[PDB]
Amino acid sequence: KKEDDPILIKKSVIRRTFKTAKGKDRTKCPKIQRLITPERILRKKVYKA
RNA sequence: AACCUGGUUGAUCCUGCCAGUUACAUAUGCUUGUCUUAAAUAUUAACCCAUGCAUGUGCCAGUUCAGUAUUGAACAGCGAAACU
Ligand SMILES: [Mg+2]
Ligand SMILES: [Mg+2]
Ligand SMILES: [Mg+2]
Ligand SMILES: [Mg+2]
């Protein structure tokens, strides 16, 4: 539900594994623009200050 | 260098012009060893056009699940595309 804290969503995302044309094995994942971090929170108080 | 000289007569003195004389612009002829400097399709068509180039751009700080590198388990180096 909404009330759900960030950290929940951080580790609840998805990752992808693949073998490269280079015979390599990497693990990749995306950033989540919209994630409610403390930084976003800090800034808002700062602004109203 | 605030200069002028030849030509109208058989001689002469005049107006007066043609001519010479001078500078400077493009043209052009002939001739060209250095160094410094340098204009350059404007005039005749603001006429026509092959071809190549003449305008692009990214950071620490708008979006990277491209790719690299086995890299803070959300994402942290470099770093194209593409939306901005
Ligand atoms: Mg007479
Ligand atoms: Mg005579
Ligand atoms: Mg007479
Ligand atoms: Mg004259």
Short mmCIF file of all heavy atoms in Angstrom, two decimals, chain B residues 8-9 12-15, ligand 1:
data_model
loop_
_atom_site.label_atom_id
_atom_site.label_comp_id
_atom_site.label_asym_id
_atom_site.label_seq_id
_atom_site.Cartn_x
_atom_site.Cartn_y
_atom_site.Cartn_z
P U B 8 53.21 77.86 -85.74
OP1 U B 8 53.66 77.72 -87.15
OP2 U B 8 54.00 78.71 -84.81
"O5'" U B 8 51.71 78.37 -85.74
"C5'" U B 8 51.35 79.60 -86.36
"C4'" U B 8 49.85 79.69 -86.59
"O4'" U B 8 49.16 79.57 -85.33
"C3'" U B 8 49.40 81.02 -87.18
"O3'" U B 8 49.16 80.86 -88.59
"C2'" U B 8 48.02 81.27 -86.55
"O2'" U B 8 46.89 81.09 -87.38
"C1'" U B 8 47.92 80.22 -85.44
N1 U B 8 47.57 80.83 -84.17
C2 U B 8 46.25 81.17 -83.98
O2 U B 8 45.40 81.00 -84.82
N3 U B 8 45.97 81.73 -82.75
C4 U B 8 46.88 81.98 -81.73
O4 U B 8 46.49 82.47 -80.66
C5 U B 8 48.23 81.59 -82.03
C6 U B 8 48.51 81.04 -83.22
P U B 9 50.37 80.84 -89.65
OP1 U B 9 49.78 80.80 -91.00
OP2 U B 9 51.35 79.81 -89.25
"O5'" U B 9 51.00 82.28 -89.48
"C5'" U B 9 50.30 83.43 -89.91
"C4'" U B 9 51.23 84.60 -89.98
"O4'" U B 9 51.71 84.87 -88.63
"C3'" U B 9 52.50 84.33 -90.77
"O3'" U B 9 52.32 84.53 -92.18
"C2'" U B 9 53.43 85.36 -90.17
"O2'" U B 9 53.06 86.64 -90.63
"C1'" U B 9 53.08 85.24 -88.68
N1 U B 9 53.88 84.28 -87.89
C2 U B 9 54.95 84.77 -87.15
O2 U B 9 55.26 85.95 -87.17
N3 U B 9 55.64 83.85 -86.39
C4 U B 9 55.39 82.49 -86.29
O4 U B 9 56.05 81.79 -85.49
C5 U B 9 54.30 82.04 -87.10
C6 U B 9 53.60 82.93 -87.85
P U B 12 57.87 86.23 -84.23
OP1 U B 12 58.79 85.59 -83.25
OP2 U B 12 56.74 85.45 -84.79
"O5'" U B 12 57.27 87.57 -83.61
"C5'" U B 12 58.06 88.74 -83.58
"C4'" U B 12 57.23 89.92 -83.19
"O4'" U B 12 56.40 90.35 -84.30
"C3'" U B 12 56.23 89.64 -82.10
"O3'" U B 12 56.80 89.63 -80.82
"C2'" U B 12 55.26 90.80 -82.27
"O2'" U B 12 55.75 91.97 -81.65
"C1'" U B 12 55.21 90.93 -83.79
N1 U B 12 54.04 90.25 -84.39
C2 U B 12 52.79 90.75 -84.05
O2 U B 12 52.64 91.71 -83.31
N3 U B 12 51.73 90.09 -84.62
C4 U B 12 51.78 89.01 -85.47
O4 U B 12 50.74 88.55 -85.94
C5 U B 12 53.10 88.54 -85.77
C6 U B 12 54.16 89.16 -85.23
P C B 13 56.28 88.56 -79.74
OP1 C B 13 57.41 88.38 -78.79
OP2 C B 13 55.71 87.39 -80.44
"O5'" C B 13 55.09 89.30 -79.01
"C5'" C B 13 55.30 90.53 -78.36
"C4'" C B 13 54.00 91.27 -78.23
"O4'" C B 13 53.49 91.53 -79.56
"C3'" C B 13 52.87 90.51 -77.57
"O3'" C B 13 52.94 90.52 -76.15
"C2'" C B 13 51.65 91.27 -78.09
"O2'" C B 13 51.44 92.51 -77.43
"C1'" C B 13 52.07 91.50 -79.54
N1 C B 13 51.60 90.43 -80.44
C2 C B 13 50.25 90.38 -80.74
O2 C B 13 49.51 91.23 -80.23
N3 C B 13 49.79 89.42 -81.58
C4 C B 13 50.63 88.54 -82.11
N4 C B 13 50.14 87.64 -82.94
C5 C B 13 52.01 88.55 -81.81
C6 C B 13 52.45 89.50 -80.97
P C B 14 52.20 89.37 -75.32
OP1 C B 14 52.58 89.57 -73.91
OP2 C B 14 52.48 88.07 -76.00
"O5'" C B 14 50.64 89.66 -75.52
"C5'" C B 14 49.64 88.63 -75.40
"C4'" C B 14 48.26 89.16 -75.80
"O4'" C B 14 48.27 89.57 -77.21
"C3'" C B 14 47.12 88.16 -75.71
"O3'" C B 14 46.54 88.11 -74.41
"C2'" C B 14 46.13 88.72 -76.71
"O2'" C B 14 45.44 89.83 -76.16
"C1'" C B 14 47.07 89.16 -77.84
N1 C B 14 47.40 88.09 -78.83
C2 C B 14 46.37 87.33 -79.39
O2 C B 14 45.20 87.57 -79.08
N3 C B 14 46.67 86.34 -80.25
C4 C B 14 47.93 86.09 -80.55
N4 C B 14 48.18 85.09 -81.37
C5 C B 14 49.00 86.86 -80.02
C6 C B 14 48.70 87.84 -79.18
P U B 15 46.51 86.73 -73.59
OP1 U B 15 46.50 87.04 -72.15
OP2 U B 15 47.54 85.81 -74.15
"O5'" U B 15 45.09 86.10 -73.90
"C5'" U B 15 43.94 86.69 -73.33
"C4'" U B 15 42.77 86.45 -74.23
"O4'" U B 15 43.20 86.62 -75.60
"C3'" U B 15 42.20 85.03 -74.20
"O3'" U B 15 41.23 84.92 -73.16
"C2'" U B 15 41.53 84.93 -75.56
"O2'" U B 15 40.20 85.38 -75.54
"C1'" U B 15 42.34 85.89 -76.43
N1 U B 15 43.09 85.23 -77.50
C2 U B 15 42.30 84.58 -78.41
O2 U B 15 41.08 84.55 -78.32
N3 U B 15 42.97 83.97 -79.43
C4 U B 15 44.32 83.96 -79.63
O4 U B 15 44.74 83.51 -80.67
C5 U B 15 45.09 84.64 -78.62
C6 U B 15 44.46 85.25 -77.62
MG MG C 1 45.56 85.42 -87.88
#
